[PDB]
Design a protein around this nucleic acid. Structure first.
Lengths: 91, 78, 119, 96, 104, 88, 98, 83, 94, 108, 88
DNA sequence: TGAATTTCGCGACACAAGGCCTGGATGTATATATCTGACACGTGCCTGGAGACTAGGGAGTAATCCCCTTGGCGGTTAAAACGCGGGGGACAGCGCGTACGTGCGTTTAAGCGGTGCTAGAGCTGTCTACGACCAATTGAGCGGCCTCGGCACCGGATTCTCAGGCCTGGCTCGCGATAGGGTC
DNA sequence: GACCCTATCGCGAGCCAGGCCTGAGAATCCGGTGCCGAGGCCGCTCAATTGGTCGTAGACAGCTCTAGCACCGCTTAAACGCACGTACGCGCTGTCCCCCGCGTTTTAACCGCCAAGGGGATTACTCCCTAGTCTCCAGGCACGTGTCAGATATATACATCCAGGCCTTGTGTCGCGAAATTCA
């Protein structure tokens, strides 16, 4: 009933201005997005529970990203998340 | 209907994975392995179907059964 | 048996048994030491028939007290070294009233022989 | 009549099938097998075609991975022809 | 006046926050966690799509199909390590033939 | 047809068998031959080959040397002939 | 005259004794120093509870024992008795660790 | 004092005993360096998660539960140090 | 200072029930604590995911039974189903 | 004011129903927890614990011992098919291994 | 030490070889031996056996029979002795 | 024609060689003393479990629509099944030299003991920014329609790839001669 | 210095390897034709947004006290290094049998169509199961104390290897019976 089709399309048009994507690949991207979201949310929940906490803040998300994503992807994702949070807070 | 998985099908599957020459005893062993794997997956799929009191096995039940066994499947969601 | 048996051996391997119908030739290491028979050749003469030559592998050893039998192709036996050998290239060792089998070493010298003669 | 030495046609098949992505198992026999297997656990079950296709995709991927591991095992043993012992060793090492 | 625009993102912050709230992951959810998660998802999607697009021009095609995604995922060390236990429909396999299989 | 001692002598090479091992040659005949100088079987074989395997010459010489009769000389000639046919 | 077993009987005795025993096979001090050296690479000046080091050693020993079981299976597959680095590499690659 | 090159602390007899436990009969001579590398990689990949868990808690001592959770993430659950 | 909870007494009672004259060391008791916690976590997580799949917000005995079927293999599954059914029937009858 | 008996006593269980119910409520597994679910879970846990402890006690009996040690638990678990399948990923501290030597290793 | 003719004669039983096949024996020596009556290899070995394998007697007889020299008689005696030790 | 001579074959006497009965050195499993620190038991307490009763929303139950699953028929093939020729790939046997197991003297650093301290884990107290909750908004995003071009498919060149026949060459086998050794 | 006998080189003839050239089959590149799904457009609607309040989760300040870290010394278990023996993996070869490539016959998969109804999705109504709160109370946790299970070590009974001593078996021998041949 709901998916991430339009956002994946916008990102694809942002990175490759002249390349399209078939429907089955769009469903694959939706499944991948759901999988990554579930993994990160579960890791953040476990991290919050281990510390006897009851709130999932950005620090838990950053720690989960460090734990899950390997190497360079972790550094890049941390940088992007920090920049996004800074821009959101500053405005 | 386990014989429905013909020898050419197993041969093509082996050819895709990089197998050059195939023995003659490979086929029955592969049939048994496929039977065991299908038993394991379909048991969980039928359990999921019975939990919702439905008489039809949906694709999401198969997807969840695969996800539980550690082999995530993309594209059939859902 | 209507065949007279005459044998002579100067080495450690003697020609033990010869099939009168040419199915096999049987040799034995009659010593207490293993005998190497690499590149050894056996010459089979059957009366006036042309000579048959069988060549052992370049490295081959018959241990002490062991028996090696060279089977003809028509015998239908299964090759099993070092005890059983089947000569697939030759259908039969041949027949006749004067069968002579000689064991020739790698240096072209005869060291063993058994001859079957019929009246 | 023209003839190819054995192995070369196998390499051509390997290239052609690795370049392609279609399913290597006929759909009707697999569907009949799946319906047969589900009969042992329940009687009057119905299957969506999408579920059967997903099961077929999963089985094909699992068999492809198992055959890759088996080929690695056989190549380790200084052999080029796979054997049931290779499959059993791969399944035992994988944890199955 | 959208949270994605405020953070300069493309993924929906509100949808991620709603999924976090409805998913029974915690009793309370922080304000910046959906923003950080959306940023991470955007970067991962952008990386995957960039690799897939680079793979697409290598065989003269112009549209991304599951084969392109499979090639892009299996051709990268980090992405393959991240998704080592994942099956992609219609994906195929990477061309990989052992040297001992090659003649001579 | 053939005496057993003849079969034993023909089956294997003489080597160093005594003259008494010859078929038809016994203790008295063997002792006489040894006294004459022919103390070994192969020594008799040399003289036999000198006479070119002739039956009459060899048997008559055997009679004149030790006193063997027709039967013993015939047996000895047959044994030596079979040995020559089998090993020589 | 001297009593000398055939090479392998001592190995069998070691196998039986070690499979019958349950104690640790790596001395604590070198492993602890190795763990501290590895840890200092990520963050400097970190402290370790003794039980944490014990748990790390237990996990490493169990992982190595399982890896060596798999590598012995691999070596036996090639009709050999001695394990080789290629056996360990093949076992790890099949397990998916590499 | 800065600690360096403690990988040699994993002695050859220790690796030999570990192999003897697993059923290995005869051991090569080049196995030891491969075992050292494997152990180094595994220890790095575990201590990384352990240190990350410790850092999230704003602590400077690595508790045993951090190691237990790090092993739990990688599919190797550990019984006996859970409390 | 702070109370810490564990399953020592219950495992001890179960052991005394099954084996009247056998003792359990402390290390084995901690191992049993870890085993109980791990199994409980597995069952609870599977039940939670199953309940979320069907758009439900309640964990009834049916979800627990289905999770037990999914997790425990073979004879253990049937035996646990029988034990849970008997326990539920006895609890509901009084 | 009636005399109070624990839910375990009502269900005839040794495990605590109340503690499991509290853990389920505090575990953030769902918004709601059923009444019979803690009873079912406690029964399952009791059965599993009884099975493991019985196997461990038999193993301890076999080797002349009278007290359960982690080696006994390891031997009991690894010698049962279903428990081994259930606990395939579990490492037992101070548990050792199963005594086993490959057939080819033995002299011919 | 040994000539090729010597090895060739020793490697096989004499059978029906001519007297010239003996090592150290030329065409002239062989023809003279044939004229004397010893027209075959085995006939010469008969003489060798008769003289009880004595080196001096055999070589002197060969010298007095065909005119062989020290070298030829030495070669002939050696070949005959080796043949006797290998087959007889 | 009978006596003498001779050869082949048979049965008691003596022999060595092999197989079975018994005892000592040897390492391996078996019973007992000791002690010790951990396990089992007994008790104070206090917080978590239990008992009653209420509201309210989650779920069960009944009815309906259509959809998509199942069932079945007709053809066209593409795929499957079977037989044959074969040459390639598995397997066993045999060196072999090189690398590892085994044993003994060496050292060196691990393990155990004992000590201090202080950095930091853990626990308690304050309160304040921060997130849950609820009414109104409205536009961003989802559902249905169209269209047209990227791609599937088919046909035709173009170059590539695999495989085999003919020619040139090298390498080996065998008879005769010029030179070497010995004799005279 | 001449003469007899033997020995290695020269050259004819045949078998095996590799290179040049061509042909069959295929992969590929290029162009034309059609099609149906992806991308865009428009209508619609309900979930994200905004504002404000309120209860509190955890962040800071501070204190205690504990165990991790640092240090030293003694003891000896084990790591270390050397040499030697042997066994073990690697290489090579020959045997064989068995899948692979190819061709011919078979068959049922698949596509397209039709037809019905089981049940999945949905909506509406009711009710009752459980979150929540207060009040009560006893079960299990923290603490202390005793005693015995098992580690530790020594002394003793039993299986195993190997050698000494006694009994059984196959064999060689020598005088004599049975048969044939030649000379007095």
């Amino acid at each position: 009933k709901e998916s991430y089709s339009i956002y994946v399309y916008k990102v694809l048009k942002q990175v490759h201005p002249d390349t399209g994507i078939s429907s089955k690949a769009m469903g694959i991207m939706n499944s991948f997005v759901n999988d990554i979201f579930e993994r990160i949310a579960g890791e953040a929940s476990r991290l919050a529970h281990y510390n006897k906490r009851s709130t999932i803040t950005s620090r838990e998300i950053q720690t989960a990203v460090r734990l899950l994503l390997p190497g360079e992807l972790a550094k890049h994702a941390v940088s992007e998340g920090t920049k996004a949070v800074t821009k959101y807070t500053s405005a | 209907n386990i014989q429905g998985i013909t020898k050419p099908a197993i041969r093509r599957l082996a050819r895709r994975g990089g197998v050059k020459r195939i023995s003659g005893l490979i086929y029955e062993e592969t049939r048994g392995v496929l039977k065991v794997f299908l038993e394991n997956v379909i048991r969980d799929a039928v359990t999921y179907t019975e939990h919702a009191k439905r008489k039809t096995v949906t694709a999401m039940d198969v997807v969840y059964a695969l996800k539980r066994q550690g082999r995530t499947l993309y594209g059939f969601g859902g | 048996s209507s065949f007279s048996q005459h044998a002579r051996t100067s080495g450690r391997v003697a020609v033990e048994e010869v099939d009168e119908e040419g199915k096999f030739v049987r040799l034995r290491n009659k010593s207490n030491e293993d005998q190497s028979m690499g590149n050894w050749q056996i010459k089979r003469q059957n009366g006036d028939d042309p000579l048959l030559t069988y060549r052992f592998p370049p490295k081959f050893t018959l241990k002490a007290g062991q028996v090696v039998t060279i089977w003809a192709a028509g015998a239908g036996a299964t090759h099993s070294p070092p005890t059983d050998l089947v000569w697939k290239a030759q259908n039969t060792w041949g027949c006749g009233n004067s069968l002579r089998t000689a064991l020739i070493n790698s240096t072209g010298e005869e060291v063993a022989m058994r001859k079957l003669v019929r009246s | 009549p023209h003839r190819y030495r054995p192995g070369t046609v196998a390499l051509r098949e390997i290239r052609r099938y690795q370049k392609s992505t279609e399913l290597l198992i006929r759909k009707l026999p697999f569907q009949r097998l799946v319906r047969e297997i589900a009969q042992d656990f329940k009687t009057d079950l119905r299957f969506q075609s999408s579920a059967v296709m997903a099961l077929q995709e999963a089985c094909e991927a699992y068999l492809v991975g198992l055959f890759e591991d088996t080929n690695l095992c056989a190549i380790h043993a200084k052999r080029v022809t796979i054997m049931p012992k290779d499959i059993q060793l791969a399944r035992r090492i994988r944890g199955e | 006046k959208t949270r994605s625009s405020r953070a300069g993102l493309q993924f929906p912050v509100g949808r991620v926050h709603r999924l976090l709230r409805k998913g029974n992951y915690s009793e309370r959810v922080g304000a910046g966690a959906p923003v950080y998660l959306a940023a991470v998802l955007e970067y991962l999607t952008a990386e995957i799509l960039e690799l897939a697009g680079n793979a697409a021009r290598d065989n003269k095609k112009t549209r991304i199909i599951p084969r392109h995604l499979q090639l892009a995922i299996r051709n990268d060390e980090e992405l393959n390590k991240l998704l080592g236990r994942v099956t992609i429909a219609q994906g195929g396999v990477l061309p990989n033939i052992q040297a001992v299989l090659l003649p001579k | 047809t053939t005496s057993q001692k003849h079969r034993d002598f023909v089956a294997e090479p003489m080597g160093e068998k005594p003259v008494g091992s010859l078929a038809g040659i016994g203790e008295v005949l063997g002792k006489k031959l040894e006294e004459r100088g022919f103390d070994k079987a192969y020594v008799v074989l040399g003289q036999f080959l000198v006479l070119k395997k002739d039956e009459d010459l060899f048997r008559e010489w055997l009679k004149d040397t030790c006193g063997a009769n027709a039967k013993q000389s015939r047996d000895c000639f047959g044994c030596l002939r079979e040995w020559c046919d089998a090993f020589l």
